[PDB]
Amino acid sequence: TKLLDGKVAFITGSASGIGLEIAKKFAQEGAKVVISDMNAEKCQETANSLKEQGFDALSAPCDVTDEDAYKQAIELTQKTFGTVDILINNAGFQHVAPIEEFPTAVFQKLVQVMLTGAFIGIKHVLPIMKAQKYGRIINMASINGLIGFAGKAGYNSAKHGVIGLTKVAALECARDGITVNALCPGYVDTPLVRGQIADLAKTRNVSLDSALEDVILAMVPQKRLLSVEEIADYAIFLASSKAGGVTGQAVVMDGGYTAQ
Amino acid sequence: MTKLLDGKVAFITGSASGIGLEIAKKFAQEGAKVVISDMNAEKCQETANSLKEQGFDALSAPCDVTDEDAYKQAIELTQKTFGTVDILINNAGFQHVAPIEEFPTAVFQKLVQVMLTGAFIGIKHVLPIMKAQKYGRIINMASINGLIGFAGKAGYNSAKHGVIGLTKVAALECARDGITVNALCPGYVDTPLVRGQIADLAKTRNVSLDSALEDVILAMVPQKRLLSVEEIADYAIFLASSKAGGVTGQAVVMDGGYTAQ
Amino acid sequence: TKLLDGKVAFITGSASGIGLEIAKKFAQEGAKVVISDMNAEKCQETANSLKEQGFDALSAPCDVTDEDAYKQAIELTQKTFGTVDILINNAGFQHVAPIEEFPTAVFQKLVQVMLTGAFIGIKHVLPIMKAQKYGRIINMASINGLIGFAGKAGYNSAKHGVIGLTKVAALECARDGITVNALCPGYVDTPLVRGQIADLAKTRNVSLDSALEDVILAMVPQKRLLSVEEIADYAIFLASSKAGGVTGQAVVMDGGYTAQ
Amino acid sequence: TKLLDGKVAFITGSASGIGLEIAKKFAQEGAKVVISDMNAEKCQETANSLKEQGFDALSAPCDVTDEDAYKQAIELTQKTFGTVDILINNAGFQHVAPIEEFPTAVFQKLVQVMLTGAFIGIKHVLPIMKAQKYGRIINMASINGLIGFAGKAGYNSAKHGVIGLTKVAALECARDGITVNALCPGYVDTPLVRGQIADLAKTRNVSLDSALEDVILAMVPQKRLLSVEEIADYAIFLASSKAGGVTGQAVVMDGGYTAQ
Numbered sequence A, C, D: 001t002k003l004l005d006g007k008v009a010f011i012t013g014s015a016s017g018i019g020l021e022i023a024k025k026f027a028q029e030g031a032k033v034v035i036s037d038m039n040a041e042k043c044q045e046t047a048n049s050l051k052e053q054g055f056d057a058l059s060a061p062c063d064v065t066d067e068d069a070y071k072q073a074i075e076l077t078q079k080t081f082g083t084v085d086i087l088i089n090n091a092g093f094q095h096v097a098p099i100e101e102f103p104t105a106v107f108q109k110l111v112q113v114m115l116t117g118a119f120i121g122i123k124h125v126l127p128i129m130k131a132q133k134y135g136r137i138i139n140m141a142s143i144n145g146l147i148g149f150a151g152k153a154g155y156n157s158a159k160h161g162v163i164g165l166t167k168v169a170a171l172e173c174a175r176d177g178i179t180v181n182a183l184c185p186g187y188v189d190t191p192l193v194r195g196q197i198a199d200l201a202k203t204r205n206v207s208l209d210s211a212l213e214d215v216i217l218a219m220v221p222q223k224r225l226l227s228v229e230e231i232a233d234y235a236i237f238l239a240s241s242k243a244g245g246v247t248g249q250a251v252v253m254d255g256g257y258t259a260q
Numbered sequence B: 001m002t003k004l005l006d007g008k009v010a011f012i013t014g015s016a017s018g019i020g021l022e023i024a025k026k027f028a029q030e031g032a033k034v035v036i037s038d039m040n041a042e043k044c045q046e047t048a049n050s051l052k053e054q055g056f057d058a059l060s061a062p063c064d065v066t067d068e069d070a071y072k073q074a075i076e077l078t079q080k081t082f083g084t085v086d087i088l089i090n091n092a093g094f095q096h097v098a099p100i101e102e103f104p105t106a107v108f109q110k111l112v113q114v115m116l117t118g119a120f121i122g123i124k125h126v127l128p129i130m131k132a133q134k135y136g137r138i139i140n141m142a143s144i145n146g147l148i149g150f151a152g153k154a155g156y157n158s159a160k161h162g163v164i165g166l167t168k169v170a171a172l173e174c175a176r177d178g179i180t181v182n183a184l185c186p187g188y189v190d191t192p193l194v195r196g197q198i199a200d201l202a203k204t205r206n207v208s209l210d211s212a213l214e215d216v217i218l219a220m221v222p223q224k225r226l227l228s229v230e231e232i233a234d235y236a237i238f239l240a241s242s243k244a245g246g247v248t249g250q251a252v253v254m255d256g257g258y259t260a261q
């Protein structure tokens, strides 16, 4: 079964972690994938690997805060694969700090990448998806789009914001056969989080396994990291023709974090 | 093709009609062994037998979900027949629309007993089976009416709100036991229940059936369409599958954008 | 100085805890209060102490699960004070158990008192409030109306349901000068909770302080019990003429619990 | 009774609409109020009116996007009234358009004023409020912080974001006697909205009453505009010492909008 057979998916931040797994899993589902990241070296390598494995893949690097570059990356996608069926707004980063020590510029950058970048993508894929009366837009958000976490003023503001953007975008294209959803993971086993576990274990002087099980997963009822494979499986369902009635939703995959 | 529920036993309450019946047929196509449980023991036997004629593993285990003794025995019959319960779908329900002042208390209590207490009884009697095997999928068929209000639906919206409360408690109690508990929340599905309500509104208002649907039911639906039972079954398959082990405690919404505005 | 002057407040479960405080504080704001509880002797002495302080108080005991007694308690209020302006559906109780050890009858009872009780109160005051084009209904819920907690299947199901009833009721009287809101406290310093701290302290062989600071309040960002007066102050605001634009809301007072 | 006696309130955008009402109502409840807006003559005019009526008021204009100006306005307040007890992040604007014809720079501007402006305000009052272990921060949001509305990508993104910032901020100061809440009105009777009724009546060739009652209020159960007075009354309660237990909340007054 090829759930995304020949569907054209553009995935921002797809050179690492969740975005890279989505791209691999989408290709295996039969999607034509576009690897898009800051790092144009890792983009070209990723797309070349996929091509060598017999997949349709394109390197179209861009900074999602660079509207002109994001625009041309979509136009390159149209020229290569004819259309865009699926946009995954996945590009992001993290800066943890008390509000008092939280540089305004860093706050503005978290918002620009993870909110304005999503808005820029939606703005330039909407005409393609409305012309063909089909589309799937997934904004990679977080449970931090639904609840608060101390030290994450910029991240939680950006992810809250992309849930509002998701709902506005959904309402504007609900008649055009296009869905816009925010996939909200909890803690995922990624380089980023393995970094934070690394950080916690030195800064608290506990083991890597104690940093994970006693602090990172203390408020996770399943007491486990989500796999990138699980996130990509939900993304595949929402991006499929079978999820046409799901739109305007903060779709939560969090091992019960927000249930308590 | 693939069998997303291969090797799993699915007990589905209210599975002799509408959404329950589509879930049972689609779960079977995904390689689940399905138990058709409903009030109408006649339609259950016929449903299960028709599935069996199409090469599927189906059991007729009729019960009234408000009858804890009959529910417990329907679960026991499933264990005896298939060995275990992997997936419980709490889907049995009904509707009674009236202003609160003309809403009989007993009808309010019955709506709550069937759609809330019924889901509680099901959960209490599958939990030990699922916990001993460290695997389970519990889906409560709630509604967007579990998350928002609608005038005249005091009993329904009260039961469906409550079943989302019960989903969260259950999810927290079995989070470490490889069991998920979710509330699948449809908006308007093209079913007998809903086609009945369109006829009602069209009589009482003396508009045409298309007028009642398009001007009243679908006014609030951004997608301006009824969902298909197939769409609900497809979400139910994903949540009931091994692929969704990290989804729990959730009101999972498929509503054509209804709660987005 | 008198935010409820000339208003008639019917308060279920007002013989103890939050309901008792709401009755006393509502009287101070110039409301005529009906003390209604299971224990008729405590309703009489409460109403009498209030009367000795120059307040207008009526004893109207009932079991809120007894629609005939509830209906007769409302009728007696109409007979004595001319109308019901404010209904406080406050009557409740708690039973904590794993779902496996949770008796179905106890589950049903929790739902009958805290959901059905509320439906019965609302059904019998709505015609009175709709006739005068003025009402304030407050369903005393809990953050357990909004999130899950292990061992509270019955209570969390009842409280979730009363938020559902609250939004339905609100929509049905929105044009009639009536509001219907669910006040949702976190942990409040009441006999009920002081009981639960004493319980936890024996069960875990810890101080009363440790049971409170380290178990009860570990999920409360403010790390404190709410006072019954704080709950009463929010109840007075929502029950006052100044809150006519608040309806259909789960109004949360929880020292930040639901923010995490 | 003066509910904010001896409190200093800093209100951004207080030269007009909800902010102006909050300043005049906070003054009547005994707050020293700071009038801060873009319009510097209107702030001096407003503050002078309150002074003539026996009220403590200070003009301290600033663009909330100008962190250096906002920091100096908070400093001027410290110099004049000793401290800041209450911050009302109120400054906002609106721009309605489909995503495709929604200028990226306008989207950025809505977020910069209504999310980043609040971040800057919170960042510079938190050390003052933490030092004295007392504070009240109210971010004026909107039901558009909780649901989607077609054509308001920028506004709904910004309001969604400010609720995220509210929950983060609440968690960072929950132990410090500081509450952070987002007050979320539906349609309020303001120059802003009357403007919008004027536009709908003209661009749809219908009466002002047609355009309000049949279009703007179509999704409002109470079928009425809220008053600036109603918003101010909830703002006063939230900002009072009586609301110490309310924090990290999206506090909704929407005549039932979000109940359906």
Ligand SMILES: NC(=O)c1ccc[n+]([C@@H]2O[C@H](COP(=O)([O-])OP(=O)(O)OC[C@H]3O[C@@H](n4cnc5c(N)ncnc54)[C@H](O)[C@@H]3O)[C@@H](O)[C@H]2O)c1
Binding pocket: A012, A013, A014, A015, A016, A017, A018, A019, A036, A037, A038, A039, A062, A063, A064, A065, A090, A091, A092, A093, A113, A114, A117, A140, A141, A142, A143, A184, A185, A186, A187, A188, A189, A190, A191, A192, A193
């Ligand atoms: N990993 C988690 O635990 C977790 C939790 C919840 C949700 N998410 C969200 O999912 C997304 C994936 O994060 P991840 O874990 O894969 O992190 P990661 O660090 O592995 O990958 C992030 C990628 O984003 C790229 N990027 C950053 N800014 C960019 C920009 N302006 N334009 C283009 N590319 C840019 C980086 O180059 C990098 O390759 C993020 O938005 C994150 O907030 C992650």
Ligand SMILES: NC(=O)c1ccc[n+]([C@@H]2O[C@H](COP(=O)([O-])OP(=O)(O)OC[C@H]3O[C@@H](n4cnc5c(N)ncnc54)[C@H](O)[C@@H]3O)[C@@H](O)[C@H]2O)c1
Binding pocket: B013, B014, B015, B016, B017, B018, B019, B020, B037, B038, B039, B040, B063, B064, B065, B066, B090, B091, B092, B093, B094, B095, B114, B115, B141, B142, B143, B144, B185, B186, B187, B188, B189, B190, B191, B193, B194
């Ligand atoms: N149809 C929709 O648009 C829609 C939308 C949202 C929610 N739902 C929910 O999805 C579920 C399925 O709805 P539906 O319209 O297919 O059917 P329904 O709600 O009318 O009930 C379906 C089945 O439940 C059975 N049933 C009723 N009471 C029972 C009892 N006490 N014990 C056992 N079985 C009993 C009936 O015999 C029927 O076959 C229900 O919970 C409903 O509330 C439906």
Ligand SMILES: NC(=O)c1ccc[n+]([C@@H]2O[C@H](COP(=O)([O-])OP(=O)(O)OC[C@H]3O[C@@H](n4cnc5c(N)ncnc54)[C@H](O)[C@@H]3O)[C@@H](O)[C@H]2O)c1
Binding pocket: C012, C013, C014, C015, C016, C017, C018, C019, C036, C037, C038, C039, C062, C063, C064, C065, C089, C090, C091, C092, C093, C113, C114, C117, C140, C141, C142, C143, C184, C185, C186, C187, C188, C189, C190, C191, C192, C193
């Ligand atoms: N205590 C808390 O921390 C807390 C937190 C969240 C919500 N609540 C809710 O607020 C309300 C008040 O709680 P409390 O702590 O003051 O409770 P409490 O147990 O101290 O007092 C409740 C009163 O209700 C009465 N009552 C019980 N069943 C009744 C019935 N069927 N009919 C009439 N009266 C009945 C009892 O006799 C008692 O006087 C309850 O609904 C409770 O669930 C309390």
Ligand SMILES: NC(=O)c1ccc[n+]([C@@H]2O[C@H](COP(=O)([O-])OP(=O)(O)OC[C@H]3O[C@@H](n4cnc5c(N)ncnc54)[C@H](O)[C@@H]3O)[C@@H](O)[C@H]2O)c1
Binding pocket: D012, D013, D014, D015, D016, D017, D018, D019, D036, D037, D038, D039, D062, D063, D064, D065, D090, D091, D092, D093, D113, D140, D141, D142, D143, D184, D185, D186, D187, D188, D189, D190, D191, D192, D193
């Ligand atoms: N109007 C409504 O019904 C409604 C409903 C929901 C929310 N709100 C919110 O309430 C608040 C007040 O709205 P209003 O109706 O009083 O509008 P208004 O236009 O009368 O008030 C807005 C004020 O903010 C000022 N302002 C704009 N940008 C600024 C900046 N960068 N720095 C400083 N001041 C700036 C303007 O000069 C103006 O005085 C806004 O945040 C708005 O989003 C309004």
Ligand SMILES: CCC(=O)CC(=O)O
Binding pocket: A093, A094, A142, A143, A144, A155, A185, A186, A187, A188, A192, A193, A196
């Ligand atoms: C959303 C949880 C998370 O992973 C935020 C972050 O640390 O990037």
Ligand SMILES: CCC(=O)CC(=O)O
Binding pocket: B095, B143, B144, B145, B156, B186, B187, B188, B189, B193, B197
């Ligand atoms: C949730 C839609 C529905 O099924 C309510 C009803 O029965 O009218």
Ligand SMILES: CCC(=O)CC(=O)O
Binding pocket: C038, C063, C065, C092, C093, C113
């Ligand atoms: C003993 C529990 C309770 O107080 C319920 C009732 O009054 O019927």
Ligand SMILES: CCC(=O)CC(=O)O
Binding pocket: C094, C142, C143, C144, C185, C186, C187, C192, C193, C196
């Ligand atoms: C916080 C809800 C509640 O009241 C649980 C309890 O009974 O202590």
Ligand SMILES: CCC(=O)CC(=O)O
Binding pocket: D094, D142, D143, D144, D155, D185, D186, D187, D188, D192, D196
């Ligand atoms: C309804 C919230 C609001 O005030 C947005 C607008 O219409 O300006």
